[PDB]
């Protein structure tokens, strides 16, 4: 009986509990977006120069004028829902680093993290995009 520290706000209550219980936390969220549900909010937002590397994985925030900067351990769904990681054992990619997303698609940065995967060539977002291809 708090006596504790609040990490979360009501608007996200429903979604997270859903994704928590799901056998497929990925699909669960995805579908929820379809249901007319609001995407995750309150994830950690950076005050940045907006110049820097465009790269999606950064050790310190690097944003393009187009992209915006996020703590990103907030934008990792499995970190955010406190459930196991897609990686078999056991670790997470987005904890201990930062992540950038185009400002338009930064409405739901959590999905954006799941939806796309960064190439090992330029270490940057694929399709948002790559000098490769």
């Amino acid at each position: 009986g708090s006596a504790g520290n609040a990490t979360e706000v009501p608007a996200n209550s429903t979604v997270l509990s859903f994704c928590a219980f799901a056998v497929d936390p990925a699909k669960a969220y995805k579908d929820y977006l379809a249901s007319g549900g609001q995407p995750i909010t309150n994830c950690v937002k950076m005050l940045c120069t907006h110049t820097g590397t465009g790269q999606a994985i950064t050790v310190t925030p690097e944003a393009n004028m187009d992209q915006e900067s996020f703590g990103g351990a907030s934008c990792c769904l499995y970190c955010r829902c406190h459930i196991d990681h897609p990686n078999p054992k056991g670790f997470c990619d987005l904890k201990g680093k930062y992540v950038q997303i185009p400002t338009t698609c930064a409405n739901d940065p959590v999905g954006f993290t799941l939806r796309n995967t960064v190439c090992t060539v330029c270490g940057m977002w694929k399709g948002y995009g790559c000098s490769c291809d």
């Binding site: 504790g4 706000v9 509990s17 669960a28 549900g37 406190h82 196991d84 904890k95 930062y98």
Partner: protein, 514 residues
């Protein structure tokens, strides 16, 4: 400003907030990085290398509509449709004293079944790399009533163990009766939280290798399964639940239960609490008498019981009329006319508490009580066929259900009562010797008045249509064999046959002689 949730509360005793990365949310990040509503990176002030923060799972509050995803909570109506999907669930708990504080963990998980599973305090804990399911220190809740939970802290058992134990105990209890589960609970919240551990969720799916919808999920290898063909399945794939207290009762569960049922006492053991939640939910819906609008698929063996019910009724009460030549027969517990023996010169009088709108003029409206009604029915004979009452009148033919016996048909109820279901399930009082005090137990016999017509079976007890001989008369010898077979089925489904003390097989022979 601003609004916050009990859900995912950070119960750690850590005084510092979290580095903007490795922090779960902007609410979490420490003051030091926050400016102008934004959060900002300070290479200068380092992220924790090693930390353990307990995350509270409480007030899970899940109400959502997804087209592919089925509601976890069900309507009062929809919960009636599925009964003995019904299992009472109340989980005692413990709080974290030492490494962190502020949330609650499952200690003893109670069930409507006597079963009690205990667990070692286990909670979700956050580290730099991952969220990690692990043991925790915990204390018994503060009250003197809770002093009995102390020993349970040490006892057992690994959660990966428990969730399989739950699924098997749930698997074998529910297998024959239903295709799904519903949990009947008093405090919606805590036991939803306890559900995090064993339960998973998702759009409906079919049992793997099997025909029907899946109850269970196995993590070991991605699979789905039902109650039937499933073991080594550690999870529950799509449970259902409903909150009784959500129905507007005034008091605490113990008060509400204790009025209706004096059979369930109090031990604060978690099962007792989860029994009481069914025992009371049953009463609420099913002591309201015999709603005929509901429809319950039958499996099984019941249909044969259904017919054998009528067959043994017809014959007994026929003979009973021949033997003792009653002027009048008082049928009690007959909503509709429906004479069990269509044709008898006997004056047939109908009584029930609720008459059917059709055939209402034929029936007299009465609630039977031995205290009021022993005086009045003296003349003739009385018939109660599955009309269950306090102690019965001396002159009587009655069929009552014995709660005590167990079939896949009937389920526990208040108080000592069982709730029997084939269709139109009727909750019934508890089997009591005191009600049969005047009547005597009815020995099996077979009576046909007929002309006669592989191996012969000769039976001392039957009034053979022809007893001159052996006499195995291939029509009766076969017909007796069939009736005794469907009679031994009705008694196997646990019905009881009681008759007036006066009745004697012999008086039947006199109808034969001519």
């Amino acid at each position: 400003a601003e609004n916050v949730t009990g859900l995912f509360k950070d119960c750690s005793k850590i005084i510092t907030g979290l580095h903007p990365t490795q922090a779960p949310t902007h609410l979490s990040v420490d003051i030091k990085f926050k400016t102008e509503g934004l959060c900002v990176d300070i290479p200068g002030i380092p992220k924790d290398m090693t930390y353990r923060r307990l995350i509270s799972m409480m007030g899970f509050k899940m109400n959502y509509q997804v087209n592919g995803y089925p509601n976890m909570f069900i309507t009062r109506e929809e919960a009636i449709r599925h009964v003995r999907a019904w299992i009472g669930f109340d989980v005692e708990g413990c709080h974290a004293t030492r490494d962190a504080v502020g949330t609650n963990l499952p200690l003893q998980l109670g069930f409507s079944t006597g079963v009690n599973l205990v667990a070692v305090p286990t909670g979700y804990v956050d580290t730099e790399n991952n969220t990690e399911f692990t043991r925790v220190n915990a204390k018994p809740p503060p009250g003197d009533q809770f002093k009995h939970l102390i020993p349970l802290m040490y006892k057992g058992l690994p959660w990966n163990v428990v969730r399989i134990k739950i699924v098997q105990m749930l698997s074998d209890t529910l297998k024959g009766l239903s295709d799904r589960v519903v949990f009947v609970l008093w405090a919606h919240g805590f036991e939803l939280t306890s559900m995090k551990y064993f339960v998973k969720i998702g759009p409906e799916r079919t049992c793997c290798l099997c025909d029907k919808r899946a109850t269970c999920f196995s993590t070991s290898s991605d699979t789905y399964a039902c109650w039937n063909h499933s073991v080594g399945f550690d999870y529950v794939y799509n449970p259902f639940m409903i909150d009784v207290q959500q129905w507007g009762f005034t008091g605490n569960l113990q008060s509400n239960h204790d009025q209706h049922c004096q059979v369930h006492g109090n031990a604060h053991v978690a099962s007792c609490d989860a029994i009481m939640t069914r025992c009371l939910a049953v009463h609420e819906c099913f002591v309201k008498r015999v709603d005929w609008s509901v429809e319950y698929p039958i499996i099984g063996d019941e249909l044969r019981v259904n017919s054998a019910c009528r067959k043994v009724q017809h014959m007994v009460v026929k003979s009973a009329l021949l033997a003792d030549k009653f002027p009048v027969l008082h049928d009690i517990g007959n909503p509709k006319a429906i004479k069990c023996v269509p044709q008898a010169e006997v004056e047939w009088k109908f009584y029930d508490a609720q008459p059917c709108s059709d055939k209402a003029y034929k029936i007299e409206e009465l609630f039977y009580s031995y205290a009021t009604h022993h005086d009045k029915f003296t003349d003739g004979v009385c018939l109660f066929w599955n009309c269950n009452v306090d102690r019965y009148p001396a002159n009587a033919i009655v069929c009552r259900f014995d709660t005590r016996v167990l079939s896949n048909l009937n389920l526990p109820g208040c108080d000592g009562g069982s709730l029997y279901v084939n269709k139109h399930a009727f909750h019934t009082p508890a089997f009591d010797k005191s009600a049969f005090t005047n009547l005597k137990q009815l020995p099996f016999f077979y009576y046909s008045d007929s002309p006669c017509e592989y191996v012969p079976l000769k039976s001392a007890t039957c009034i053979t249509r022809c007893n001159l001989g052996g006499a195995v008369c291939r029509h009766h010898a076969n017909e007796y064999r069939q009736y005794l077979d469907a009679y031994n089925m009705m008694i196997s489904a646990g019905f009881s046959l009681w008759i007036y003390k006066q009745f004697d097989t012999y008086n039947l022979w006199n109808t034969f002689t001519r």
